[PDB]
């Protein structure tokens, strides 16, 4: 059938793994996927014990691609120490500013994700899996529903999959406008038909998740690696990139670069290389002023030689790269980040609820030149006091990037105060 219009995001790979098909901006259906050896990793996995699959995924060094970088195998191992039934959830909520890596897998190579979900589900003994996709990805939703039907018709889903005795259904759920539903516990609340309110952790979902049962939540990109780990083996997988932070990584690059798009690169690539070697440099060859790591971190032009890995001095996050150049007003950009958090706090925790609102309200006053001295002092205070009593990561980071701009670009902020 036809799907809603999608802009054709540029995609480029040096590894030819996650973007082997998704480098071309169109839906690759099951016959095309099968041609390339699609679903053969699944067939292999079904001839392995769950324990063995968990072991390979552990030894691969795969880490969560949804922002927290938790080791995937270890997560699975934790889930299976708890009595079943268990649930598997694919997190396709991708709503962080700058971040558009997951959609190109969903929309162009859905079977890569589906194959990974089935293997992952088998590994943890889940017979019921979910994809939670943000509501603003309607094409991805319809594409996934159709791909799941294709997989059923070829016997990769349903009961007694390929004679293995393993049963699996994959349900596709849709979000409805809340960034917070990407937080794994709020996602589960939404799957249970409620508001997206994060739960106090611990317990972690792997102990008590959907309907209080052991639940593994993994990001789309994380899951898209599973086929490769089974296909190649963990040893060969670990030979991709540097041996500590191994494997392909997707980098959604936007803002003031000549070639904005998604880049599949190893994690020893530097930030400078991402911008200048791969993304074609800056618009107008203007000087880089800052890189926003989505809405999380702000790196200065003195920090471009860092690796795009999960190391302490590395870029980290989700590899989201928003490039600002010399003429971009840092305070204007900070206001946009404040506005995001204002719009997305769920309001459960008081300092988060009040702090996200006040941070944006006062920063807007500052930007417009209408801030009193008290407003300035209040802004500083609030920025530093969003995190207390927070039960999820949003409250913990709502002031982080903005504080970094205050520290790294004092001269520009001072201009607004004077």
């Amino acid at each position: 059938r036809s799907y809603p219009a999608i802009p054709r995001i540029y995609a480029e790979t040096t590894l030819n793994m996650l973007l082997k098909r998704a480098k071309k901006p169109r839906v690759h259906s099951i016959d095309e996927y099968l041609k390339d050896g699609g679903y053969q990793a699944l067939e292999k996995a079904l001839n392995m014990s769950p324990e063995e699959i968990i072991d390979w995924v552990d030894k691969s060094t795969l880490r969560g691609r949804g922002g927290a970088g938790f080791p995937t195998g270890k997560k699975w191992k934790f889930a299976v120490q708890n009595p079943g039934p268990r649930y598997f959830i694919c997190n396709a909520d991708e709503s962080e500013p700058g971040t558009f890596k997951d959609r190109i897998i969903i929309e162009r190579d859905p079977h890569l994700l589906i194959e990974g979900i089935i293997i992952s589900s088998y590994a943890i003994g889940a017979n019921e899996a979910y994809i939670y996709i943000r509501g603003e990805y309607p094409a991805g939703y319809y594409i996934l529903r159709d791909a799941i039907e294709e997989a059923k018709k070829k016997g990769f889903l349903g009961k007694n999959i390929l004679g293995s005795g393993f049963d699996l259904e994959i349900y596709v759920a849709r979000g409805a406008g809340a960034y917070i539903c990407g937080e794994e516990t709020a996602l589960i609340e939404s799957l249970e038909g409620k508001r997206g309110h994060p739960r106090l952790k611990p317990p972690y979902p792997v102990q008590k998740g959907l309907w209080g049962k052991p639940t593994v939540v993994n990001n789309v990109e994380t899951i898209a690696n599973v086929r490769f780990i089974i296909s190649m083996g963990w040893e060969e997988y670990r030979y991709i990139g540097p041996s500590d932070y191994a494997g392909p990584k997707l980098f959604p690059v936007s803002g003031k670069v000549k070639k904005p798009g998604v880049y599949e690169l190893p994690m020893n690539t530097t930030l400078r290389e991402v911008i200048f070697k791969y993304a074609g440099g800056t618009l107008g060859n203007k000087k880089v002023k800052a890189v926003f790591s989505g809405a999380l971190d702000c790196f200065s032009s003195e920090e471009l030689d860092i690796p795009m890995d999960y190391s302490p001095l590395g870029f980290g996050g989700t590899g989201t790269v928003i490039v600002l150049t010399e003429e971009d007003d840092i305070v204007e950009a900070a206001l946009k980040i404040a506005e995001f958090y204002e719009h997305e706090t769920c309001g459960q925790c008081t300092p988060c609820r009040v702090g996200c609102y006040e941070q944006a309200n006062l920063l807007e006053k500052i930007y417009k030149g209408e801030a009193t001295e008290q407003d300035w002092e209040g802004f500083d205070f609030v920025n530093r006091n969003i995190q207390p009593t927070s039960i999820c990561g949003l409250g913990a980071v709502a002031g982080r990037l903005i504080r970094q701009t205050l520290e790294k670009f004092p001269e520009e902020w001072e201009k607004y105060r004077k």
Binding site: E94, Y171, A176, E192, G193, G196, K256, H343
Partner: protein
């Protein structure tokens, strides 16, 4: 007193039958209702509540929480315009200006004929194609007023 047309009721029932538990279908149902009416009618929620086997209060709370749903304005076509950092950098304001030039409305407004509503939204996850907008489910990069005018002419 208010009742779903049978064709819509059929589709709501499909959603409710899709997940293991009925209440899991609440967002799919609300999307379906909004698609059908051009908004969420307040009167729709009690009947929906009954089908989901949920208290009305629960359904109301969910509609209020989730930003895609609109109980106030009917519109045939929602023009969702990204106002987050990357689109702002790359020209949200030019898109909005072009929209006002073509349609005569600003964010939050509906045209008098009820045809178009401009809806400011957070990052749509297409930042490389900034500035981004949607027309209902279709999504586009804004290039210019001439280009936008041609896109919008496809929605009648």
């Amino acid at each position: 007193e208010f009742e779903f047309p049978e064709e819509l009721k059929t589709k709501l029932q499909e959603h409710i039958n899709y997940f293991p538990k009925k209440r899991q279908a609440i967002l799919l149902c609300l999307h379906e209702i909004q698609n059908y009416y051009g908004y969420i009618p307040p009167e729709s929620l009690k009947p929906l509540a009954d089908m989901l086997e949920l208290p009305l209060n629960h359904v109301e709370g969910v509609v209020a929480f989730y930003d895609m749903f609109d109980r106030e304005d009917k519109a045939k076509y929602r023009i969702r315009v990204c106002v987050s950092i990357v689109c702002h950098l790359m020209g949200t304001n030019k898109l909005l200006k072009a929209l006002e030039n073509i349609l005569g409305i600003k964010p939050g407004e509906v045209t008098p004929d009820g045809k178009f509503k401009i809806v400011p939204v957070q990052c749509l996850g297409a930042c490389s194609e900034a500035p981004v907008f949607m027309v209902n489910d279709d999504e586009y990069k804004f290039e210019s007023e001439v280009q936008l005018n041609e896109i919008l002419s496809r929605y009648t």
